[PDB]
Symmetry: D2
Subunit: 480 residues, 4 copies
Amino acid sequence: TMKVINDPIHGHIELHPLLVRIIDTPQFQRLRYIKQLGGGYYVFPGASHNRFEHSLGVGYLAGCLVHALGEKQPELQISERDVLCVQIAGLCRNLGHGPFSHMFDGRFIPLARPEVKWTHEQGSVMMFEHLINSNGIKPVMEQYGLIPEEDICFIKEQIVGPLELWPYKGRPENKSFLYEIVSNKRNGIDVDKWDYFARDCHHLGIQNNFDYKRFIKFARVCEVDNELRICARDKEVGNLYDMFHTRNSLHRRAYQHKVGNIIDTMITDAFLKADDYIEITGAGGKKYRISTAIDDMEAYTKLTDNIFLEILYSTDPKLKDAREILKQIEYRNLFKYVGETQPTGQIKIKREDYESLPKEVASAKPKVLLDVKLKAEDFIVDVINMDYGMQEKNPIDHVSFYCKTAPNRAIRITKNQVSQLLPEKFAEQLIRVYCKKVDRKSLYAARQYFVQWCADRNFTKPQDGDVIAPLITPQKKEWN
Amino acid sequence: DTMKVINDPIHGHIELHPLLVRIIDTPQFQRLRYIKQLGGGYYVFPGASHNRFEHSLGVGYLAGCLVHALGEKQPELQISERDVLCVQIAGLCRNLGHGPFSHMFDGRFIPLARPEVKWTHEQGSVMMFEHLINSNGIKPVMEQYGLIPEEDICFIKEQIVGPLLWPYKGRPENKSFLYEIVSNKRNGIDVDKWDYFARDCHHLGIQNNFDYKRFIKFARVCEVDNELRICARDKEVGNLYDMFHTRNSLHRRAYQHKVGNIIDTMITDAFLKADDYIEITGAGGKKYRISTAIDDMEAYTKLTDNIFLEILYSTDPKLKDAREILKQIEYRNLFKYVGETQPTGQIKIKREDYESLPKEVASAKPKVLLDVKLKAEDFIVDVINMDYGMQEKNPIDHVSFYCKTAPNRAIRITKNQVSQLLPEKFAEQLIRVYCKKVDRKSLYAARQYFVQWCADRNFTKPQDGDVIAPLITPQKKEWN
Amino acid sequence: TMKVINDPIHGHIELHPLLVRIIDTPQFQRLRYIKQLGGGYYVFPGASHNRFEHSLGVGYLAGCLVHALGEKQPELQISERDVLCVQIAGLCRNLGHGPFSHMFDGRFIPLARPEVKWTHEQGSVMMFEHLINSNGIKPVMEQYGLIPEEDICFIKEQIVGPLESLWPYKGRPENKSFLYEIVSNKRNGIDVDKWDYFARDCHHLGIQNNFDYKRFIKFARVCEVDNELRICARDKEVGNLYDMFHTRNSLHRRAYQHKVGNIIDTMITDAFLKADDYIEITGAGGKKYRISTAIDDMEAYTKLTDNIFLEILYSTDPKLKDAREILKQIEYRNLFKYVGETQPTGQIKIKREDYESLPKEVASAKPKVLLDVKLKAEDFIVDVINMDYGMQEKNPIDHVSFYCKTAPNRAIRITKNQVSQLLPEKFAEQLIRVYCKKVDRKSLYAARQYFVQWCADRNFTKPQDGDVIAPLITPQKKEW
Amino acid sequence: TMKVINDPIHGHIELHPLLVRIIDTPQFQRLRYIKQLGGGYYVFPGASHNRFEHSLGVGYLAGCLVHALGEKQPELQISERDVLCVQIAGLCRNLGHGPFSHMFDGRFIPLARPEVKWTHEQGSVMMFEHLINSNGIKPVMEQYGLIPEEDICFIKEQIVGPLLWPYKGRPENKSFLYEIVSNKRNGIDVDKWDYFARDCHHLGIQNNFDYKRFIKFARVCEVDNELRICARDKEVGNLYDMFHTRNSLHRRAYQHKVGNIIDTMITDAFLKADDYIEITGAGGKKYRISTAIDDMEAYTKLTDNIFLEILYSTDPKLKDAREILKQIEYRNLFKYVGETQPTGQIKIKREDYESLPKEVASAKPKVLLDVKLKAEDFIVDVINMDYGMQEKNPIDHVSFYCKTAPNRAIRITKNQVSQLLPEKFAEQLIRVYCKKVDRKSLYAARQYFVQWCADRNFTKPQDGDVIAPLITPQKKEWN
Ligand SMILES: Cc1cn([C@H]2C[C@H](O)[C@@H](COP(=O)(O)OP(=O)(O)OP(=O)(O)O)O2)c(=O)[nH]c1=O
Ligand SMILES: Cc1cn([C@H]2C[C@H](O)[C@@H](COP(=O)(O)OP(=O)(O)OP(=O)(O)O)O2)c(=O)[nH]c1=O
Ligand SMILES: Cc1cn([C@H]2C[C@H](O)[C@@H](COP(=O)(O)OP(=O)(O)OP(=O)(O)O)O2)c(=O)[nH]c1=O
Ligand SMILES: Cc1cn([C@H]2C[C@H](O)[C@@H](COP(=O)(O)OP(=O)(O)OP(=O)(O)O)O2)c(=O)[nH]c1=O
Ligand SMILES: [Mg+2]
């Protein structure tokens, strides 16, 4: 039988018994202990929500879209088997997230294990495999008409893309539109965003959203270059632009909030300091570190936001340094935000260069009297890539549309056909600088270094530059 | 008289000072209950039943909130209760001048019915305001509550319509910031937008709006070029860009919906056909027409959306033609939307040229076989100016900011200091074409004329151009 | 073909072309000019909504429920024909409402035409026929597979009940009995009409309360009950059903029967009575009707809407001076004054036929207090309001069938004692409001004395403010 | 300066710097790790919210109400000092909650430490004292004009009541201030107002109390020789609705049958872990889950984390505790059998709760059964549902005023309002569950249960005729 669940975003949602079986596992229930926005909760107190409930939402919306396409276009031959596979992929696409979500894969792993190339998407696939095998799900899949060999492959492909011509093995070209629902590699328009827009806004207290219900009603499948793809109605093109504008707004105001990011940074530092001493038991009783738990799904299953509290509540002297950082978070003695700037023209900063940047800021030499002299280790420089999901490219150039007068005929719509008030660029970098020395004099010094460093590098003038560094800003003619 | 509490679905329970209640409980104000905020938009968005009355309450309330907030935070501004009430009254009364179907009346009907005259709802609001005050003995009531009618009436009118050197007489330069609350001529950031974003979204069914409560909390007054102005906190700049983006979204999706506009056009047409025959009694028993009721406020008081029904329910044979158009609206036999295009690059179309455009479309000679030949009178061409409120200018360039480290010091923030993902242009024109002949063949013909016309004029390729006019689009090399 | 409409309560809803044909008629579109809450708009400014949009909502929810039952239980043999008939009945159940909705049938007609018995439900049926016959809808119905003779009967029965046991309906047989429970549930009043108005009225009034109908639809099933197939609710929903009726009563108390909204309805009714001789409405064959006789000709009734209010207000004819003066008093907020509220004690119930005598009784009370002025029957208005759970003294939940998870096909009854001791022991009551047409201070004071004396004389409940408004009277009654 | 914070329920709220100092302490931040609804999150997935954000809301609303009263009635002499003390009490009233909130004081402590009498309210006062002393807050209070000796007493009194006019923190002329945060007279306070709105937002139930309306109509009047908060007469129906809503929310959410069983399972796991888990308190001294309430330094570190510490443990001593939590993750929960209520006169005492599983197991249904069940196979959960004041009507303990005499307080009786109101204001619900989840065990449990209801003259379970068609006929009253 169906289970009904009340979700505050989507209302009462029905879950097929197979989905319930997947949900009621330690691998899935784990998502209850991982905050969707990580350190954002420490800035937006409404953002208490966890990955668990977001995953239900994604699974539900995936089901909505595939059901809608099937109702409208029986000739697509969408089967219940297809519907369940799409729902399962929707449910399980977040399985791979670690403590504090993007902090873990965005900050901690890159620093702890630079050799490795690792993403929550890969984690989701591994967790999914572990979930299936640990809980005897394959037999249950067969009971409901699924074919595990093909369908597990199809599900993994929906999350992570080809495990590698038509590159997919889980389904053929005629069902290509199914791969656009959960995680859309072509243009990023998928049900994951649609849930998190609505859920995050509900919790953050921001009244913004994408109308996904409207979008689903106007979605159709058409042939595009000998593939069946999801097409949007021509009139939806402006709403799609708005969708990405919203996404960017949410990153600016919330996901990349300057303080939420510094808290993530502080937690990451604490995890690095604890990484040698914390042990997580995996398969065979055998022990992993925070940074190696990714190698064993049984261990990774037990790696959640709980680690934060394990460190905070520890008494072991080896963890004193890690614990001290978290204590500073509770007292709100955070690293201090100094300012924000951007690279000018086409200058872009490489990931490998990130390490050198604190050194560059400390090297600056402002022509101002300073009580204190700061060092590289006193500065944090956070570089944030902001885009429309596709680096420099416009995702709407990778969207196919149809018109009311010829619903089967797919078309392209260029930016110029829509509006001159749209963005001319679709990617940029933000640079935030913080100082670990929080006293008045240290902070004043840090401002001088920072603004001097912006000038030296011909970055943009910080918005408060004339107030925080009135002696420095006059030197740069461009600024005034 | 005592203070009144009223439950508004947008703002909750709001308190109204007895003076404001006296102004509200007049025929001149209550009239606004019978004018739809969005006019013909109700005929596309069925939730948009709301009238100008309740919007006016909201504007008055928010005007009060902002001025109170400024006073609390900065006593040195010397904001008085008298100032607060004047600002609230201007907020309440700013919409008094709207006519039937709001912007239809101002924007479409009067320009066509009385081209000699130059008329705006803003001017109407001032005239109505005067009429309201004098007809209802409000001046004595104003003095009772500490207002000085000569100065304060002038101040209120100036807030609505601008000046009738420091050009204002109602308040001096030290109180300049008060003129920025109700109708902000400098940059358009005022409480009117804040109420209509939230109210229209609530009714339309679209999730958006601007967080005005947040904005009020971060608003301050600072000296700018020897004037005291409202300044926003530096960190709010992105939210201000977002405010205008939202405004433009709402215009695109709702206020300029292609069908809501054609319904307004049809109603305008019916009013033109009824203008000779409908009589409205004004001062001294003198009779006016729909188009001349603007000259006498006693008459204009009785001119509301009711005239629509007076025409629809008429039996007089003189009104048969007007009545037939409205009947077509009820049967949904509307003029048919042919398409949309834009001028390319810097071309702009003047208001005086609008008349000639249907002639131009009818003069296009598409190289296609047509059964039927269309005439100028068969075409409607609607030209819509879409901007950020200041024609080609960026309103954020006319905003002053302050930073946390020096709250009294105003600064400027340029677009390059905020984001490269912002618009490079801030005004554009949309051109919609419709046809009054609704049969299949007439419509097909209209499409060919339209696309040919776009090509001839080097306008943008209509989004569905290749589908509606496959023979025409190939000729233009630019289009493909 | 399908139309999509954005409703702020339900989101994007699809309408089948047949329903669109019904909607795009003067008989339907008329509902755009009738306020859902009538005079309530004059108390809650958000309540600008009209019967039109509510009707779309009812039609949509009727569809949702019937679709849900069909998905879950294919063995019911629900056909698309069934679905459309249920939707049409949902759309059309409000067609019979007159100006200001319940004012018209609840106040005006009873007073203008006491000989006649008339209800909006009967109006809806008559309007429905008129709509079908005037617009050639029967052929269109046949085109989509409907059988007009049966189906029109079925639709009318859904609105108004049987047109004259064991099975009293002709439009559908006992096996389809559950379909008659969707639009207007005569058995217990649990239907989609309430579900829409709770959510819509709350959204507009600014009250957060509503009933979770989407939850209810998910738990609804059809079971055999006494050889009929009926809708049954899950046992666990019984408390939510009690809550549904509590919400209904809350809404009546706070809004639909707000003391001032009611007095405004009363004033408008008085104005209509005074205009009834002079206003003419053209019906079939050019024949002329009055406001009170337009109910006899649907062509005339089609043109009878809230517009009449403004026609009276804006009139210059001296015959209409008295009517017009009443409406003018409404605009100035010079209303009949609320004196107080009381209830009958224990057994006592007051009949509609007695309503005329009550003002006489109040005027006959002889308070032992010094009075400057002496009041007459004609100076008093006594409004008696019946508040119940939809079924006079009866508990509607006693007329609900439930099922349990362990035997889903087995219908059961649940008594009040099986649910809670905190529920109501009675399900009907009366409120008595008294108002005075003389608004001066001395007249009002006198009215209060008559009123409280009258309450004491009749052993009604002590008005809440009784000791404040009549400190000399309340001591005489020992109980109080 | 003021901090501004965006709360999804209240919007942008300003926090005075003193309140920020109190918030940015381990004692306060601890509330981030305690779910407001405990096991309810396991039934309503939207209910992720913690006590922390609820406490911000309560503090804000406390400020709103006191500010409103001050604006409207300057003659009350409400000072900024008064405002801050009321806000602090609002912020800090939830400080004393333990893991999974009401589970801890409602289920676990009573079972683990029956000799002790403990409430989260007492915990809040103890935590508050610990917070102040540990973080040097007293000097900061004086900096902003507070007088710690009087004002700390006043704050504690607001949370827990008195430690003649029985209060020492403020005099009788300021008595209305004690009605804002935790209203002992009738329960109408800002704590409910926040949790109604916040819980509804998260649970997905569009129900609520309009507290903004209420605040606008609230006034202080003399009642007896006390200054009290009085509501406008017209708000009486809203106040009845407020308690109806409260009871609705308890029925649908806070006492959800499955949420309660999960709380019961977690409590059981804690009891099994209580001997083995150690929490370091003051002086390096070690405490147990059940004794951490004696030392605030230890209690500071006692949060929902303990659930995961047990779940992730490898120690064999914790196997039994860990197994129970593992069953929760697999959703192998004890099964709900049914619900019943005592009839007429009858009420069940707390001391009798233990015996009830024995009584159910002792019922002898006249039906053929494959399996025989034992006392230990049954859980019987007895829930007292009321309007906050046992049998009493809280509206009888509310004072009102009318628009014609705003300074004259009055009473409004139930009969003056409506005959559709409740005639009783307290009742008991009895839920029975079975630890044996198989088909045959279930079927047996249902027979025992319904027989037991019959034997005890309890109400007929709603599905009684379906689950026990052989049993229900014997009882004439039922049919
Ligand atoms: C009882 C109830 C539950 N809910 C929510 C909580 C859950 O997320 C979801 C399902 O809860 P329930 O409907 O209570 O489902 P259940 O599994 O507890 O009962 P059973 O298996 O006997 O049918 O609905 C409400 O929103 N409102 C309510 O009134
Ligand atoms: C009674 C009531 C009114 N309202 C709304 C309707 C109105 O817009 C607003 C004020 O209505 P009321 O509070 O009814 O005020 P009133 O002027 O009718 O009564 P009095 O003059 O005696 O104080 O509040 C609610 O939102 N909830 C309620 O429970
Ligand atoms: C354009 C648009 C419309 N709406 C609403 C307004 C209407 O109620 C509903 C239908 O609007 P449209 O989708 O614009 O439908 P249409 O009939 O105008 O277009 P076409 O016939 O070419 O398909 O959608 C939105 O909610 N958001 C939007 O962006
Ligand atoms: C930036 C931003 C924050 N918020 C929320 C997040 C926080 O809860 C709250 C405060 O955030 P900020 O206003 O960013 O406060 P801050 O302390 O980071 O900035 P500063 O100290 O420089 O003044 O507002 C929004 O709602 N919208 C926004 O656009
Ligand atoms: Mg009033």
